[PDB]
Amino acid sequence: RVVAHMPGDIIIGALFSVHHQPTVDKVHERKCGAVREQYGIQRVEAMLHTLERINSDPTLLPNITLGCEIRDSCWHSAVALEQSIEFIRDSLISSEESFRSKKPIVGVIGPGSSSVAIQVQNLLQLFNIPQIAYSATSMDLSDKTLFKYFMRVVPSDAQQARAMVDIVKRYNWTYVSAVHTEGNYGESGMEAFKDMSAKEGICIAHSYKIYSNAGEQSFDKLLKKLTSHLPKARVVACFCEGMTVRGLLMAMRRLGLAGEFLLLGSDGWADRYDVTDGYQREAVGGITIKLQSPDVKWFDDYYLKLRPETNHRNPWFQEFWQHRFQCRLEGFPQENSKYNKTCNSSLTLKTHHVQDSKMGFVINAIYSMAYGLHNMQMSLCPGYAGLCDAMKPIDGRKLLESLMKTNFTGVSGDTILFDENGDSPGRYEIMNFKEMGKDYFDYINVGSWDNGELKMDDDEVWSKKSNIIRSVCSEPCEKGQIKVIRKGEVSCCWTCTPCKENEYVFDEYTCKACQLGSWPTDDLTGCDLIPVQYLRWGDPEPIAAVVFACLGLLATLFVTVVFIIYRDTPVVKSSSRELCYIILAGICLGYLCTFCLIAKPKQIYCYLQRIGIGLSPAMSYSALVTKTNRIACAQLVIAFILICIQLGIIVALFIMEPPDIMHDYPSIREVYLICNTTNLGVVTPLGYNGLLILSCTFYAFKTRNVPANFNEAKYIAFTMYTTCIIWLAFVPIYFGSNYKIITMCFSVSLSATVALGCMFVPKVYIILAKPERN
Amino acid sequence: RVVAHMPGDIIIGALFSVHHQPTVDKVHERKCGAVREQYGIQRVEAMLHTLERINSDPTLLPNITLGCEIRDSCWHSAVALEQSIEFIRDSLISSEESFRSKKPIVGVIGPGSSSVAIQVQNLLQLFNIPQIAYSATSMDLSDKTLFKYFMRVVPSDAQQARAMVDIVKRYNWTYVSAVHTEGNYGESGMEAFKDMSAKEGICIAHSYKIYSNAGEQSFDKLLKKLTSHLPKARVVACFCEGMTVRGLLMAMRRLGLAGEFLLLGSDGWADRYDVTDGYQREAVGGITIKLQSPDVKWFDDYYLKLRPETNHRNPWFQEFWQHRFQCRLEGFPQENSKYNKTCNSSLTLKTHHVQDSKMGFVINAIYSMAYGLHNMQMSLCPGYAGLCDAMKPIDGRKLLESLMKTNFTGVSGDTILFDENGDSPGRYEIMNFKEMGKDYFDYINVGSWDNGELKMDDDEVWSKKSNIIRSVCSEPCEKGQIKVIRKGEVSCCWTCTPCKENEYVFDEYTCKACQLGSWPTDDLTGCDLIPVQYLRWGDPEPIAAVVFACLGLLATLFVTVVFIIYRDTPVVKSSSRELCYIILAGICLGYLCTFCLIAKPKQIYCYLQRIGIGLSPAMSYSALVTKTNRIACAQLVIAFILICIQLGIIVALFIMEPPDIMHDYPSIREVYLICNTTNLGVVTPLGYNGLLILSCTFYAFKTRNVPANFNEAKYIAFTMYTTCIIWLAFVPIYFGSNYKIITMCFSVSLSATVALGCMFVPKVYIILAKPERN
Numbered sequence A, B: 001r002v003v004a005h006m007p008g009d010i011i012i013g014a015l016f017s018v019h020h021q022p023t024v025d026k027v028h029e030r031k032c033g034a035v036r037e038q039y040g041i042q043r044v045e046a047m048l049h050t051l052e053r054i055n056s057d058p059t060l061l062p063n064i065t066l067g068c069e070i071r072d073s074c075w076h077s078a079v080a081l082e083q084s085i086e087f088i089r090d091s092l093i094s095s096e097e098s099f100r101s102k103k104p105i106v107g108v109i110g111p112g113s114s115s116v117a118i119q120v121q122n123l124l125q126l127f128n129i130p131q132i133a134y135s136a137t138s139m140d141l142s143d144k145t146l147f148k149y150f151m152r153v154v155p156s157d158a159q160q161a162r163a164m165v166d167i168v169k170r171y172n173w174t175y176v177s178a179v180h181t182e183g184n185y186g187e188s189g190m191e192a193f194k195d196m197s198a199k200e201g202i203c204i205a206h207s208y209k210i211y212s213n214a215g216e217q218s219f220d221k222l223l224k225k226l227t228s229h230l231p232k233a234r235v236v237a238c239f240c241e242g243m244t245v246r247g248l249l250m251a252m253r254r255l256g257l258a259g260e261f262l263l264l265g266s267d268g269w270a271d272r273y274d275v276t277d278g279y280q281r282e283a284v285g286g287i288t289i290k291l292q293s294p295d296v297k298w299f300d301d302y303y304l305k306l307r308p309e310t311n312h313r314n315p316w317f318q319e320f321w322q323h324r325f326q327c328r329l330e331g332f333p334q335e336n337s338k339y340n341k342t343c344n345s346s347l348t349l350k351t352h353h354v355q356d357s358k359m360g361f362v363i364n365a366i367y368s369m370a371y372g373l374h375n376m377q378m379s380l381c382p383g384y385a386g387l388c389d390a391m392k393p394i395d396g397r398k399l400l401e402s403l404m405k406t407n408f409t410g411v412s413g414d415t416i417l418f419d420e421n422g423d424s425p426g427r428y429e430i431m432n433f434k435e436m437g438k439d440y441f442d443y444i445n446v447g448s449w450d451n452g453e454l455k456m457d458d459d460e461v462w463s464k465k466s467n468i469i470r471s472v473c474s475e476p477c478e479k480g481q482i483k484v485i486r487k488g489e490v491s492c493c494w495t496c497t498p499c500k501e502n503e504y505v506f507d508e509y510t511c512k513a514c515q516l517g518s519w520p521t522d523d524l525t526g527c528d529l530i531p532v533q534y535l536r537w538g539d540p541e542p543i544a545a546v547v548f549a550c551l552g553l554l555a556t557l558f559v560t561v562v563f564i565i566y567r568d569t570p571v572v573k574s575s576s577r578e579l580c581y582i583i584l585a586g587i588c589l590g591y592l593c594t595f596c597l598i599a600k601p602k603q604i605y606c607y608l609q610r611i612g613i614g615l616s617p618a619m620s621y622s623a624l625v626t627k628t629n630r631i632a633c634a635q636l637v638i639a640f641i642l643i644c645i646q647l648g649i650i651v652a653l654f655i656m657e658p659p660d661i662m663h664d665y666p667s668i669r670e671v672y673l674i675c676n677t678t679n680l681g682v683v684t685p686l687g688y689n690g691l692l693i694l695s696c697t698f699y700a701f702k703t704r705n706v707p708a709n710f711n712e713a714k715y716i717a718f719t720m721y722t723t724c725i726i727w728l729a730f731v732p733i734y735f736g737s738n739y740k741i742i743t744m745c746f747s748v749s750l751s752a753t754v755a756l757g758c759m760f761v762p763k764v765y766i767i768l769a770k771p772e773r774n
């Protein structure tokens, strides 16, 4: 086993993926693969020069030299576990005390794979050793109930899903499709995405849990299933890997459905143009995310000046010079005979210098542990250059307490701050694969994201407002009368359903209905009451009844001259001078019933309208049948008792029925203004009227041969044969249409006008028209 | 560091609590405590002699020597973790390859504490090393989703709670109280107990989460809160430790409430008479549980023959001889000067030989790994004495597969079988602290439990059937009429609520009600229909109507002699000979209405009863008013038309009302048998009868001065003044009580009998009684 070592006071180890992973036949022999350049030796020399800088910077840890013990991880779980066993036994022999030098391992950094770091944490919890990673992105590692000693200077995939939710939230897109690859990277990220999409109502058609190496027929079936949701969903969010997006683009070329689907993605194709290699006509318009990766000139100047004759601190730098430049440095102690060519002295290092994209994150973690130890020194050893007895030795409980509450500016100047879950906030970059002038598109920048701060250039993409259409299931309905209704599939496939004419829009998926006599406004906001009728205007239908009542009241005073002044003429002396007066008064009240009925409906006017309908034919017929019965001192008594019968009947009716003003409801849009007119109160005086008129007809048919009072009985019979038709035809016309005022003002005045013009007008025809018997 | 080592082919380590646990000032210096005799060196020598026996037994692993590497655990988590780091680096240097001997650690046994084994498993999962414990009882360790490489030859606390549920289930106890101490032993066991008690409806008053070192005032408050549930709950189940039970007994002595509470417990006071030390008057009757602990003579014979001059294999046996017998063996290499006295040569070892109670479980785990390796040898190296290339090397995946499906007989002969959770089933012992003849009680055996097999001696405890009363909230209710009802607190505090007289017991907490005309049986099982009345017996109330109808039918033929035979006498020649015949026929039908009404209600009999009630006074009165009107060829026509009027009326009634047989419901317990008798069908013939009788009375009052037919009109008027009272008083008596058959059979026959005896009997009084005008 090899180790790169730095001496010092506090030694902080690391696990870097120097070699490639071993195969299935090397899991027991631990034969690691070839040396990985970017993830490996670059991070090693970066940590070496970073601790050389931190030992040379007296701002933090002034009289404390921070050494290191760099051991390989080989990208595999078991080898990293073996080197962590080496770390912990070095810590234990330092605690207890050939190679008697002690080295208490305090912290350790790495490795890259989250599937390996999740194994390393289960070893490091037991030993009070905190560990800060730089490439683990799995969100289950945030659970410090299980993973207490795991901290990250990188954001999780949950904050990738957060930004993927936020960019859709900014673009007002609701019914979208989203796929994800199999594994802990895809599944957890899609779970966080669908958990945060429900906070904005963003619908998901169907998640397609595809595999990392699915077949071309399987990818074509997934593309057909995605097209089955089109055109209702256009944006496809793939929290997935780069080979997933490459297989989807292979399916888009093999299906020929390019230029339609919008492909949102995670950092699997962040700068990976090899995913869109040769697929630039199909990949256009896609939006991905990427961590901010600034290039640090510190490691550049510290790394381009390295030579194998100088860099003897790294025990595999000479092997890296041997294998990576494919030459045989025979003077080097790592002189391998596998390379046939020799190493020239002018063989430079600046050729193809492409450093790690995650280079700044390693230095961020190193400075995180550095300022954590500086906070420990400032908290426990106040005003001291080195370390006092409170830091002799150092366990990880108060070290975790110090690292949890740290804050500084990194190599990018980023304010590195740790939450309660021990995670740095996300600071991403947003790009587009927009087409250039020629047929060569690139991942061009369209802005960035930082913890909610979503700086975007909407004018950059589509070059206008003519974007991809809003991926939504239901359009917004016509909110004046039509309302939405859920079908039962998603929260955005609403159905534009109109509501009733008496139902206003109250809820977003329901209409409340107005009550009887109420109907909504023009915006379906509330309700409005329909107005009622005053029933007194120049309306041509009741004005005939008004003119007819005026003619009756004029004819009353026309008749009233030739017997009140002529009260001594023997034509009227033999006639009944009180009974005909009572009959004329009843006819006058029957004329006044027209004015009492066609008026304003009030608490007194309805009672004054309803008191006369029973009485005015009754007192007109009572004196008539009283005079008819005698065909010697009860002449004003029998008719008075017959009037008092109907008086008692109408008083007993009005005791049971108080005067009320109701509203007739012929429909939902018409509200009238009626009185307290019940069927009992209609029929009960009609029964007494029918009892009077049949007895009067039976008496007139018997006494129709009385010539007295200048043919009085003939005129009586001629009046009664007309009234027996009128008071019989009154019933169906009143019980038919809604003319309960109009027919009432017509027919009662008509009956009184007949009882005038066929009884009293022929009685004065031999008086006024014939002045011989005035 | 020290280690006890056995050479061999397959080396299986162990972690035994040899020393006592270090203090708070020795967690960094690892200064372990004094040597623990029972849990420590006894288990060490047991494993040494057990592997010596297994190497000498050619039944399993014939040409394989099973060595060991015994390292201390010191009862503390960190020291056991350090020695496990030593184990895994020994495994790694054996995998890779001064002291160049390799030793691949395959399995490891222990330690005792579950709180330490839960730390050791998080280290051993990462390395494919299975581990079998012998004292860990925590039930969260059964979760092999998290704890895949942890197996037990001991049952969990869940199977303690299972037996504590089962003994209560056998004793039919429902509303009990249960307390538990704080910690993972008490809390998980109480959670499993309350989870399994809900499978039997066993109520729990309130769990009292007390602490291990609660105050005496706190224990008195807990005792008062437990007495607050008394006497409704008597048995107290304490899945707790021994100091908990000792504190509860201190509270019982300080409160003086002894001799009442039943104390069920776990193995915290299994053989711990120090809990009940001096508390034997208060602790009587309590039931605890204990694992079966047989004494193995193998370790006895292998351990009593040990000497420090011989046992040089154990590197701390000489220190155990130094400290445990408090003498200074100066010739021994562990000659400590702390002991002033010297070691005699006759100083024996058999004095106070009290071995471990869990001694057999260690040997069970050793034989479990032995037969697992034997199953591996039989599965991978068939017919081979040693090990083939399939067992070179050996990881723990297929070793776990072999250990999961093992079965053998242990040192006690117990069939050790592992479930899907990797746990041995429980095989307990049940004891009681029953009083002896003197005042010295002991933990006497009352049976055992083995995976459901609950062998108990009920005659042993209480010496009779007079036991502790069943701890229940509600007694079983009187199930004849009274039903239970839940109050809303527990599933056993039911309230004995009676139900209605028409409601039968259907549910255990609800009564279903019978319908109208139905009422339950004597056991409230279903419903029963009430019988109806036939209304024809020797009942004294309708038999008067029957005798009266017979007298009427006799008087009909009494009258029918003196005018049918005497059809030429001029007394009856001037009288109406057809009209009086029609009247007599109507009286005969009115007499027949009594027989038609008081009969069996059928579809024809109800119609025949209801056809005559309208017709029989109508045809009797029609000829009467027809003869009365003439006071010349329509004499049989006018009365016929008046009969046909009522005929048409009753046909129009029976068209609207078909003949139906209904059931009168005067109450919920009485169902009668009536016909289709509606109020319309009652009033409508009564109106025609009233129209007839008033016209007949008005005609008789005018024609009461007609002396013809030997004073006929006087008898007519005298009949009519009686019928005007009868047919007017018929209405309230019929509209009052439930005599709709009785009054109908009375009054119609009474009216016909009056119309006979005041009209025709005086008409024949001058015929039969006076034979001069026969």
Ligand SMILES: *[C@@H]1O[C@H](CO)[C@@H](O)[C@H](O)[C@H]1NC(C)=O
Residues within 6 Å of the ligand: A170, A171, A172, A467
């Ligand atoms: C919703 O997002 C679209 C994105 O193109 C934008 O044009 C529109 O103005 C947004 N709606 C509102 C109300 O801002």
Ligand SMILES: *[C@@H]1O[C@H](CO)[C@@H](O)[C@H](O)[C@H]1NC(C)=O
Residues within 6 Å of the ligand: A406, A407, A408, A417
């Ligand atoms: C880190 O953040 C906290 C709160 O956000 C602030 O009080 C502190 O000053 C910051 N650290 C530095 C070095 O500014």
Ligand SMILES: *[C@@H]1O[C@H](CO)[C@@H](O)[C@H](O)[C@H]1NC(C)=O
Residues within 6 Å of the ligand: B170, B171, B172
């Ligand atoms: C428990 O209940 C069963 C059910 O009837 C009964 O047979 C048994 O005798 C009961 N046991 C005791 C101890 O009451």
Ligand SMILES: *[C@@H]1O[C@H](CO)[C@@H](O)[C@H](O)[C@H]1NC(C)=O
Residues within 6 Å of the ligand: B406, B407, B408, B417
């Ligand atoms: C162990 O149990 C299984 C099933 O219960 C049985 O088939 C097997 O024979 C048993 N082992 C022995 C040694 O009897």
